[PDB]
Amino acid sequence: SRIGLPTVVSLYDLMVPAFIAQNSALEGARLSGDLSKAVGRVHQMLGMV
Amino acid sequence: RAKLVGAAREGIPNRNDVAKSTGWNQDQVQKFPDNRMDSLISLLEQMQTGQSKLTRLVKGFLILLEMAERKEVDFHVGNHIHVTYAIAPVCDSYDLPGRCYVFNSKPTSEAHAAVLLAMCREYPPPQFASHVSVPADAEDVCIVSQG
Amino acid sequence: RAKLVGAAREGIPNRNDVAKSTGWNQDQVQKFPDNRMDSLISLLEQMQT
Amino acid sequence: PRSRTAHRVDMVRECDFNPTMNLKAAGPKARLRGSGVKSRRRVSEVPLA
């Protein structure tokens, strides 16, 4: 019964476009076939610590 | 934009500011019955606050690896649909609570309108629940698409 | 022209900019069904390159 | 030279990453247009291209 990420999807803005896009840094996270799981397998293992 | 917010919202005086800022149909904004004024003012000036969607992308990235390492999945598209940016449909859409809006930039093909849609409702039925059971946000999804 | 490209393309907000820049029929740009929007945006902003 | 047999190496999995900014580059888009002649984008994808 994890309550990890809280974001009650309140999405009023996607109804109204023509909104100035925020220029910021990109993640660019590529979920490699095997590595994407391993990252989570380390997090849960870190979560135990 | 500077035309929409101002310092604080105004009782929309000039309709020419509405035509340039946020939509099509300078004709359909010229003619607009003296009934949807209260709806349009309540609509436009409640868009400044309220924007956060971390769990929205969670269901997409969860379904990503559900059919990334596991092979292709052929599925259907079940949705309701909004039409335009600043026209009667977008004004009529605002009404009723618990209605989520997902904007489709290019709704030309079926791929984009299928993935963002299935992402939203509960956890894509009927694709083996197995691990996770994400809570269904306000059901009855309504996408915004030109086509 | 400066009206078309900008710095980078925008989600066409003002239709008055379209009337002066690149065509006739300010009437036929006023009335334009809510279906060819995705086509027109994909059309106009792929003419730079 | 010939002693023992088999073994070999299983290559490790790793992610991929990029130059960090929101906007699209002019070269990669203008040069993508040089090969094909499609009106709208087959595949229906802009960023992944």
**E-only strand ranges, chain B:** 51-52, 80-82, 101-103, 142-144
Q: Of C21, C34, C36, which to mutate for an interface test with B (greatest number of B Cβ within 10 Å)?
A: C34
- Determine contact, residues D15/A29, Cβ cutoff 8 Å: yes
Query: How was this entry determined?
Result: cryo-EM
C11 reaches D (C-beta below 8 A)? no
The angle at the Cα of B55, spanning B54 to B59, to the nearest 5 degrees, equals 125
Suggest the residue from D39, D41, D44, D45 to mutate for an interface test with chain B (most B CBs closer than 10 A): D44
A17: contact with C, CB 8 A cutoff = yes
Strand order in the sheet with B101-103: B80-82, B142-144, B101-103
Of A23, A26, A34, the CB nearest to D13: A34
- Reported as type and span, the H/E element at residue A11 is strand A10-11
Contacts of residue B2, defined as CB under 8 A and 6 or more positions apart, other chains included, come to none
Q: Which residues of chain D have a CB within 8 Å of the CB of C39? A: 40
Distance CA D31, CA D27 (A): 6
For residue A28, the chain D residue with the least C-alpha distance is D17
Q: Are B115 and B60 in contact (CB under 8 A)?
A: yes
Q: Nominal resolution in Å? A: 4.1
Question: Residue B23: what are its φ and ψ, rounded to 5°?
Answer: 180, 170
Is B114's Cβ below 8 Å from some Cβ in A? Answer: no
